[PDB]
C-alpha cells in the first residue's frame, strides 16, 4: 500500500518466530528502537502491529522517532517513545515499471502534522491561500496526494523501498505473543537440571506408569513437591526422583 494509506496487520495469539528476520539477509535497512532484536525471541508482548508501505530511499531514514519530513509529518508518524524495529529493502525490481509506476502515492500537503500511528486518507483540497477551496482545485488549492515516480533507471534515493514497521506494546493485559524457544534432547536415568513448561528443578528422569489425565500436566506428592511431569513433545509420563544425596 501507499505510505499515506499504510496497511496495518494485527499479530495476536501465535508464537512469534523472528528467525525470518535473522536468516533473510535480503534486508537493506534494519534498525530497532527501545528493544534489541537478539533479546526478542525470549520476550512477551500483549500485541504486535505490523505496518507496511512503500517509500523511496531518501525517505527511509524518516521512519524513526524524532524525525521530520513529508513522510514523518504527513504520511506515517512514530511516537517519541516508540518501541520496535524498522525494516526496509530495495524493491526496485517489483515496484517499478518501464513507463513509471505511479500506483504508490503520498500525501504532499496537510494543515497539521499527523499524530503517532495516524492514517489519513482524506483527499480534501488543501487551502494554502486566503481564498477557500469549495472542493475545487486552482489558486492555492492543491490535491493532497502526490504520486511517486518509480522507474528502473531511478537513483538509489528515488528507487522504491518496501518498509515493514513492527511495533510492540505491553499493557496491563495478558500477553499472547511471546516468541519461540528451542528445546533440547531428553536424557533419562541421569541427574539433570530440567525445565518443563517453565517449571525447573534437579532430579533423575525415569519412565513411569502413572496414568495422567489429558488435562493434567504435573504431579505432586504428599509434601507438595513435584513427583512427575508429562513431556510436552511426547505424551509420556516421567518420574522425577531427586538426585542421590546423603552423608559420609
Amino acid at each position, epitope marked *: 500500500a501507499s505510505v499515506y494509506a499504510w496497511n496495518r496487520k494485527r499479530i495476536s495469539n501465535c508464537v512469534a518466530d523472528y528467525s525470518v528476520l535473522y536468516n533473510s539477509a535480503s534486508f537493506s535497512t534494519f534498525k530497532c528502537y527501545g528493544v534489541s532484536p537478539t533479546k526478542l525471541n525470549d520476550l512477551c508482548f500483549t500485541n504486535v502491529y505490523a505496518d507496511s508501505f512503500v517509500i523511496r530511499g*531518501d525517505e527511509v531514514r524518516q521512519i524513526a522517532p524524532g524525525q521530520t519530513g*513529508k513522510i514523518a509529518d504527513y504520511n506515517y508518524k512514530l511516537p517519541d517513545d516508540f518501541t520496535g524495529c524498522v525494516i526496509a529493502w530495495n524493491s526496485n525490481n517489483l515496484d517499478s515499471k518501464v513507463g513509471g509506476n505511479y500506483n504508490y502515492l503520498y500525501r*504532499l500537503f496537510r494543515k497539521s502534522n499527523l499524530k503517532p500511528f495516524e492514517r489519513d486518507i482524506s483527499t480534501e483540497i488543501y487551502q494554502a491561500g486566503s481564498t477557500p477551496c469549495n472542493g475545487v482545485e*486552482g*489558486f*492555492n*488549492c*492543491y490535491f493532497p496526494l502526490q504520486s511517486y515516480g518509480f522507474q528502473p*533507471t531511478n537513483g538509489v534515493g*528515488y528507487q522504491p523501498y518496501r518498509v515493514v514497521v513492527l511495533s510492540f506494546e505491553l499493557l496491563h493485559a495478558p500477553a499472547t505473543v511471546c516468541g519461540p524457544k528451542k528445546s533440547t534432547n531428553l536424557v533419562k536415568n541421569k541427574c539433570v537440571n530440567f525445565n518443563f513448561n517453565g517449571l525447573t528443578g534437579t532430579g533423575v528422569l525415569t519412565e513411569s506408569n502413572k496414568k495422567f489425565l489429558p488435562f493434567q500436566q504435573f504431579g505432586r506428592d504428599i509434601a507438595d513437591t513435584t513427583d512427575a511431569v508429562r513431556d510436552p513433545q511426547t505424551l509420556e509420563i516421567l518420574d522425577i526422583t531427586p538426585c542421590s544425596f546423603g552423608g559420609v
Partner: antibody
C-alpha cells in the same frame, strides 16, 4: 512550447523610468494558477526577487523596492511588463521574468517551482 | 535578502558525491518550501529541485534534495563535467514577504 520573450532598452538614464516587457508565447498568460514574477541579478552577485502579479491585477512587491516598482499584465498583447522608476546605478542588473506556480491547474504540476524562465535582458543604468 | 547562505564554491573529484547545504531561519526554510535552481554561465537559472525534494522531468536523477529543520541540502551523486554551474536555493520568507535566494554555489569538477 511555452516560451517567454523579454524585450527592453539596454541603456536607461538615471532618475528616469525603466520599462521592460515579457511576452508569453505558446499559450496564454492568464491561464493556469501562476504567479508571474520579476527577478534581477547583478553581474557576479545573486538573484533578487522584485515582485509578482497574480489573479487579475493584484500584486505584491519587495518592500525595499515596493514604492518604485510597477508590474502590469496586458492580456490582449499576452505579455507582462515591468516598471522601475527613479533608477540608480545600484539597479544595474540582468533582469529575468519567470512564472511561479501556486495551484492545481499548472502543467506540469511543479508546485512552488518557477517553471519557465525568460532569457534575460541586460539593463545598464548609466548616462 | 541574504537569509539563505550557501558556500561560494564546492569542488570534488569525478564520480564522487557532493552536498550543497542551504542555511536559513524558521521564517523561510522552517515553514516554507525550498526550491533549487541551476544557472550556467551566461544563461538563465534552470529549475533543478522544486518543493524541497521533487525532481522535474528531464533533470538527471543524480540530483536530489533534502530538508531538515531550518536547513536544506542538495546532493549530486556522480559529479560530472556537465554539472559545473551555479546552484541557488530559494524559499519564501514569511517575515520579509519575499522569495529569498541564496548566494549560490559554484560546482567545479576537479578531474
Amino acid at each position: 512550447q511555452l516560451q517567454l520573450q523579454e524585450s527592453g532598452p539596454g541603456l536607461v538614464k538615471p532618475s528616469q523610468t525603466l520599462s521592460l516587457t515579457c511576452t508569453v508565447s505558446g499559450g496564454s498568460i492568464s491561464s493556469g494558477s501562476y504567479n508571474w514574477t520579476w527577478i534581477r541579478q547583478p553581474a557576479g552577485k545573486g538573484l533578487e526577487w522584485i515582485g509578482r502579479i497574480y489573479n487579475s491585477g493584484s500584486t505584491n512587491y519587495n518592500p525595499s523596492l515596493k514604492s518604485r516598482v510597477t508590474i502590469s499584465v496586458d492580456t490582449s498583447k499576452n505579455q507582462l511588463s515591468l516598471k522601475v522608476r527613479s533608477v540608480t546605478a545600484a539597479d544595474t542588473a540582468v533582469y529575468y521574468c519567470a512564472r511561479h506556480c501556486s495551484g492545481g491547474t499548472c502543467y506540469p504540476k511543479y508546485y512552488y517551482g518557477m517553471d519557465v524562465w525568460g532569457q534575460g535582458t541586460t539593463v545598464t543604468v548609466s548616462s | 535578502q541574504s537569509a539563505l547562505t550557501q558556500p561560494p564554491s564546492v569542488s570534488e573529484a569525478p564520480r564522487q558525491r557532493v552536498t550543497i547545504s542551504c542555511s536559513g531561519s524558521s521564517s523561510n526554510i522552517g515553514n516554507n518550501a525550498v526550491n533549487w535552481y541551476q544557472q550556467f554561465p551566461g544563461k538563465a537559472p534552470k529549475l533543478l529541485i522544486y518543493y524541497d525534494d521533487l525532481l522535474p522531468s528531464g533533470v538527471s536523477d543524480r540530483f536530489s534534495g533534502s530538508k531538515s529543520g531550518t536547513s536544506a541540502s542538495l546532493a549530486i551523486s556522480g559529479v560530472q563535467s556537465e554539472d559545473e554551474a551555479d546552484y541557488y536555493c530559494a524559499a519564501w520568507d514569511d517575515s520579509l514577504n519575499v522569495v529569498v535566494f541564496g548566494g549560490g554555489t559554484k560546482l567545479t569538477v576537479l578531474g
